[PDB]
Amino acid sequence: AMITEKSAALYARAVEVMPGGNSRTAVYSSPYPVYVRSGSGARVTDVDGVERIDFLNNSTTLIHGHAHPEMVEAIAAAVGHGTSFGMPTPVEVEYAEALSARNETFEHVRFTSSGTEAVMMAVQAARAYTERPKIAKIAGAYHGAYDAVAVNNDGSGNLISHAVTGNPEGVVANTVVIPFNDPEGSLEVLRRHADDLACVLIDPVPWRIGLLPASKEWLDALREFCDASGAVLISDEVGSYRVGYHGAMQLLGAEADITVMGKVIAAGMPIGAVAGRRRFMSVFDPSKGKPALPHSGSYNANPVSMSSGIASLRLLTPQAHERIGQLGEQARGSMRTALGEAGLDWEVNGLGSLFRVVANSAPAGYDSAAAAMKALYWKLLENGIHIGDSGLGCISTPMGEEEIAEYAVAFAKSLGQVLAEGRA
Amino acid sequence: AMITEKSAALYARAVEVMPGGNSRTAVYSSPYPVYVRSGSGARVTDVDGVERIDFLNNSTTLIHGHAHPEMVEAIAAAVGHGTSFGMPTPVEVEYAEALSARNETFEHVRFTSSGTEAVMMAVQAARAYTERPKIAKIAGAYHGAYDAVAVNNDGSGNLISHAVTGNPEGVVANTVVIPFNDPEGSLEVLRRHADDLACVLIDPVPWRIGLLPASKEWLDALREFCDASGAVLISDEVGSYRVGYHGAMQLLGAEADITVMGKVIAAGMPIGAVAGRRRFMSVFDPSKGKPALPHSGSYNANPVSMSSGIASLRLLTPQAHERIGQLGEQARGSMRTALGEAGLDWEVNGLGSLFRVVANSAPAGYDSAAAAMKALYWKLLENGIHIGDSGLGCISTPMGEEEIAEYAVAFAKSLGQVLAEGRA
Ligand SMILES: Cc1ncc(COP(=O)(O)O)c(/C=N\OC[C@@H]2NC(=O)[C@H](CON)NC2=O)c1O
Ligand SMILES: Cc1ncc(COP(=O)(O)O)c(/C=N\OC[C@@H]2NC(=O)[C@H](CON)NC2=O)c1O
Numbered sequence: 001a002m003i004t005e006k007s008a009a010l011y012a013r014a015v016e017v018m019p020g021g022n023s024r025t026a027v028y029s030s031p032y033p034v035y036v037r038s039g040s041g042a043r044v045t046d047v048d049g050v051e052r053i054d055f056l057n058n059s060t061t062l063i064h065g066h067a068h069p070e071m072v073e074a075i076a077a078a079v080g081h082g083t084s085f086g087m088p089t090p091v092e093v094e095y096a097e098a099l100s101a102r103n104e105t106f107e108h109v110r111f112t113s114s115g116t117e118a119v120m121m122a123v124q125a126a127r128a129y130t131e132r133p134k135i136a137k138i139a140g141a142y143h144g145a146y147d148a149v150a151v152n153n154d155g156s157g158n159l160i161s162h163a164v165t166g167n168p169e170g171v172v173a174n175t176v177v178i179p180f181n182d183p184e185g186s187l188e189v190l191r192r193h194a195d196d197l198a199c200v201l202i203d204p205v206p207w208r209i210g211l212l213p214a215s216k217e218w219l220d221a222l223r224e225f226c227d228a229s230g231a232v233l234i235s236d237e238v239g240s241y242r243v244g245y246h247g248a249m250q251l252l253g254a255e256a257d258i259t260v261m262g263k264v265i266a267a268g269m270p271i272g273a274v275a276g277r278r279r280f281m282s283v284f285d286p287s288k289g290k291p292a293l294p295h296s297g298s299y300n301a302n303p304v305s306m307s308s309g310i311a312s313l314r315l316l317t318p319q320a321h322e323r324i325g326q327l328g329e330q331a332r333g334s335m336r337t338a339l340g341e342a343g344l345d346w347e348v349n350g351l352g353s354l355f356r357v358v359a360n361s362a363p364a365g366y367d368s369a370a371a372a373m374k375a376l377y378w379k380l381l382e383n384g385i386h387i388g389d390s391g392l393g394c395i396s397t398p399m400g401e402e403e404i405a406e407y408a409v410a411f412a413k414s415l416g417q418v419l420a421e422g423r424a
Numbered sequence: 425a426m427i428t429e430k431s432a433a434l435y436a437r438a439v440e441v442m443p444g445g446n447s448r449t450a451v452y453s454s455p456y457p458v459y460v461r462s463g464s465g466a467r468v469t470d471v472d473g474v475e476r477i478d479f480l481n482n483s484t485t486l487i488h489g490h491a492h493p494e495m496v497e498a499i500a501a502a503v504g505h506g507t508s509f510g511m512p513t514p515v516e517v518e519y520a521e522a523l524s525a526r527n528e529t530f531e532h533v534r535f536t537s538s539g540t541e542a543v544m545m546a547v548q549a550a551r552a553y554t555e556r557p558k559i560a561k562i563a564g565a566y567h568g569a570y571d572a573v574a575v576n577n578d579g580s581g582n583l584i585s586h587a588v589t590g591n592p593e594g595v596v597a598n599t600v601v602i603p604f605n606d607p608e609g610s611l612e613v614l615r616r617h618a619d620d621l622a623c624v625l626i627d628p629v630p631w632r633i634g635l636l637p638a639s640k641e642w643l644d645a646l647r648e649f650c651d652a653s654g655a656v657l658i659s660d661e662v663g664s665y666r667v668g669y670h671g672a673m674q675l676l677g678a679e680a681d682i683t684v685m686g687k688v689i690a691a692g693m694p695i696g697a698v699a700g701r702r703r704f705m706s707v708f709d710p711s712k713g714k715p716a717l718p719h720s721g722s723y724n725a726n727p728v729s730m731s732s733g734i735a736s737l738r739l740l741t742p743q744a745h746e747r748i749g750q751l752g753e754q755a756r757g758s759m760r761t762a763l764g765e766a767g768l769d770w771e772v773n774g775l776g777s778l779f780r781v782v783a784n785s786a787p788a789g790y791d792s793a794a795a796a797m798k799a800l801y802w803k804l805l806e807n808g809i810h811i812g813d814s815g816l817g818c819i820s821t822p823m824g825e826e827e828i829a830e831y832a833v834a835f836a837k838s839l840g841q842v843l844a845e846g847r848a
Contacts, residue, residue, distance in 0.1 A: 019532045024724035035514060044506070046511075079491070107441075110443065124588065165552045165707070166622065287455075291443075
C-alpha cells in the first residue's frame with residue numbers, strides 16, 4: 001500500500017551530493033529512508049503526503065511535538081530580532097536562570113550548539129579541573145561522535161576497547177569501560193585507574209543497552225568512588241533528562257557533579273548544556289584572568305535556541321510531565337500485552353514518557369532480533385506510526401489517550417504482519 | 425558618555441547562573457561585556473537602547489547582517505513546518521545541491537551543528553580514510569575546542585606543543601605543528617611524520633596569526649606533500665570561506681581534499697559542513713553496509729539551518745561578493761590612513777570583506793599592543809561601532825559606503841581618545 005516515490009526521487013538527488021545520500025547516520029534506512037516535509041502537533045507528513053503519528057520525535061528531542069504554537073511564536077519572534085550576535089543577550093541569562101532552577105546541582109551552566117559539544121566540554125572540564133587524563137564510561141553507552149566517548153558506544157556489554165576506525169591509541173587508551181549496574185565489576189576498573197581518572201561519565205538510563213535505569217546501589221558506588229578519588233561524576237542526560245522533573249540522577253536518588261543536557265531542554269532547536277557545581281564549572285570562568293578552559297562557539301547561547309529553551313521549560317510543567325508519564329506507562333502496558341498475545345519473549349523497558357521494545361528471540365523468517373525489529377519499524381510506518389528502527393519511542397505533550405489507543409491498534413496489527421511475512 | 429547600567433544588571437544576574445557570568449569565552453570583556461537585545465541590517469541595539477554599526481557580525485557569521493528580511497522569511501517559514509525531525513527533508517537535499525555547486529571539490533557534503541563539530545568530523549574522516557594517527561596544523565591557528573585541534577591555537581608562532589590544561593599527552597602527541605607560509609620549515613616537520621600523518625589541517629587566511637593569506641609557494645608545498653604522502657589536505661574555511669566566491673583555497677589558486685565550512689554558509693543559524701571529493705567523504709557512506717565513520721547529531725541538516733543556508737547562498741550573489749569586497753578595501757584603506765595620521769605603526773590585514781587591525785608598538789600608557797587594541801575596542805563602542813577586541817572586523821551586505829565613512833570618522837576619533845588617555 002505504502003507509496004515512497006517522492007522519497008526515492010529525493011534519495012536519487014541526495015546520493016549525488018552527500019555520502020550515500022546521508023548527513024546523519026541514525027536517520028538512514030536501506031534502501032532509502034522516508035523523507036518528511038512538515039509536522040503539526042503529534043503528527044508528521046512525509047513527502048508523499050502521508051500523515052503519521054510520531055512516537056520518536058527526532059530521537060526524543062521534541063518533548064512538545066512538532067511546531068508547538070508557543071514554541072513557533074518564541075522562535076520566529078527571536079529570529080526577527082537577530083539569529084546570533086557576537087555579544088551576550090538577555091535571553092541567555094533568563095534561560096540559564098530557568099535551567100539552573102530545575103536541579104540543585106545545576107548551579108552554573110554553559111550552552112553549546114549540541115549534546116555532542118556539551119559532552120566534549122564536560123569531559124574537557126573534568127580533565128582541566130583534575131589535571132588527570134583518563135575517563136571511565138559505560139560499556140555500550142552512546143555519548144555522540146567526540147572521539148574520547150566514541151569508544152564501546154555500540155550497545156555491546158564487552159569491556160574490550162572497541163573504537164571507530166582511525167581513532168588513535170592516544171585517545172582510546174585514556175577511555176576505560178565499566179559494566180552498567182555491576183557495582184563490584186565497576187569498582188574493580190575504577191580502583192585500578194583511580195590516580196589517573198578525571199571523571200566517571202554515565203548515562204543514568206542509557207538507550208543503546210536497553211533503556212534500563214541505573215540502580216541505587218550502582219549510583220551509590222560511583223558517587224562514593226568519585227568522592228574518595230576526586231574523579232568528577234558526570235551524568236550525560238542529553239537523552240535521559242526527561243525521565244524526571246529534576247532530571248534522571250534526581251529521580252533515581254543521586255547527585256551529579258556535572259550534568260550534560262540537550263534535546264528536550266530546547267525541544268527542537270540546536271542546544272546542549274553543561275550544568276554543575278560552581279567549583280567544577282570554575283575552569284570556564286574568564287572573569288579572574290585567562291580561564292583554565294577556553295570555551296567559545298559561534299552559536300553558544302544564541303537567542304533563537306535560548307528562546308526555544310525558555311518556551312520548552314515553561315511548557316514542561318509538573319502536570320505536563322505527569323501526563324506524558326501516565327501515557328508512557330499506558331503505551332508500555334499495551335505493547336507488553338500485544339507482544340504476549342503474539343507469543344514473543346520481547347521486553348518493553350522505559351521510565352516516564354520513554355519506551356524501548358527490546359527484541360529477544362528472532363521469530364521464524366528473520367536472521368536476527370534486530371532484523372525482526374527493523375521489519376516491525378517498517379510495518380508500523382505502513383500502519384501510520386513512526387518509532388525507532390531498534391524499538392525506541394516516546395510520548396509528546398500534544399498526545400492524548402486517542403494517539404496511545406491508535407498506537408496500540410497499529411502495534412498489534414504490525415506485529416501480526418511481521419510474523420505472517422516471516423512464515424510466508 | 426556611555427551608559428551600560430542594564431548590561432551591568434544582566435551581568436550581576438549572569439554571574440549567579442554561569443561561570444563568571446559567561447557561556448562563550450570570545451564574547452567576554454572585563455568587567456562585563458555589553459549585552460544586546462536586537463539587530464536590524466548593519467546595526468545592533470544594546471540593552472541600554474544604544475544603536476551601533478556592527479563591524480564584526482557575530483565573528484564574521486552575519487554576511488547578510490542582522491534579521492535580513494529574506495533570511496527571516498525563509499527561517500520563520502521552516503520553523504512553522506517543524507524545527508527538526510528524525511527523518512531527512514527536501515531542504516537538506518536542496519541545500520547540499522546549492523553548497524556543492526560553490527566549488528569543484530565539494531563533490532559530497534555532510535552537515536553538522538557547528539564549525540567545531542565539522543572540524544572534528546573532517547579530522548575523524550581523514551583518520552578513518554588513512555588509518556593513520558597524526559594531524560599537522562598551523563602554529564597559532566584556531567579551529568575550535570575539539571581537543572586534537574585545541575593545540576598551539578593561541579596566535580603563537582612557536583612549534584613547541586602547547587595545549588589547554590587537562591588535554592592529555594595521548595591527544596597532544598598526535599598533533600604536530602608547522603610554521604605558516606614557511607614551505608621548507610613546514611616540509612621538515614611533515615616529512616618527519618609522513619608515514620603517520622592522516623591529514624594536514626590548514627586555514628588559508630588564519631585570523632589569530634594576523635589574517636594574512638597562505639602563499640602560493642606554501643600551498644603548492646603542502647599540496648605536493650599530501651599527494652606524495654597520502655595525507656588528506658583539509659582546508660578549514662569556517663571563517664575564511666567568505667574571502668572568495670568559491671572559497672579561500674580557490675581564490676588562492678589551490679584545491680583541498682576536504683573543506684570545512686560554517687558561519688556565512690547559513691549566515692546566522694547553527695551550521696557546519698564537511699565538503700570534499702567522494703573518496704574522502706566515502707568513510708561516512710552508510711548505504712553499502714556499516715559506515716567506516718558513523719556521524720549522527722540531533723540537529724544535523726535540520727530544516728531551519730538548511731533554510732537559513734539556502735537563503736544565505738541565494739543572497740550571496742557574485743554582485744554582493746564584489747560590492748562587500750569594495751567596502752572591505754575602502755575600510756582597510758581608511759584605517760591605514762587613520763593609523764598613519766595618528767602616528768601608530770599598526771598594520772591592517774585582510775582580503776575581500778574581512779579586515780584585522782594588528783596592533784604592533786604599544787603607545788604611551790599601555791603595557792602591551794593587546795591592551796592598546798582592547799582600549800580601541802572600548803572607544804569604538806563609545807563612538808557607535810562594534811569591532812573585535814583584537815581588531816577583527818568585516819563588511820555585511822546591508823552596509824554601503826556611508827557606513828564605512830562613518831566607521832572611518834569613529835576610528836580616527838577613537839585612536840585620538842586611546843592615545844590621550846594613555847598620556848593622562
Ligand atoms: C547520551 C547522549 N549524549 C550525547 C548525545 C549527542 O547529542 P546531540 O549532538 O545533541 O545529538 C546524545 C544524542 N543522541 O544519541 C543518539 C541516540 N542515542 C542512542 O543511544 C541510540 C544509538 O545511537 N547511535 N540512538 C539515538 O538516536 C545522547 O543520547
Ligand atoms: C577556523 C575556524 N574553525 C572552526 C571554528 C569553530 O566554528 P563554530 O563552532 O561554528 O564557532 C571557527 C570559529 N571561531 O573561531 C573563533 C574566531 N577565530 C579566531 O581565530 C579568533 C581567535 O579565537 N578566539 N577569534 C574568533 O572569534 C574557526 O574560525
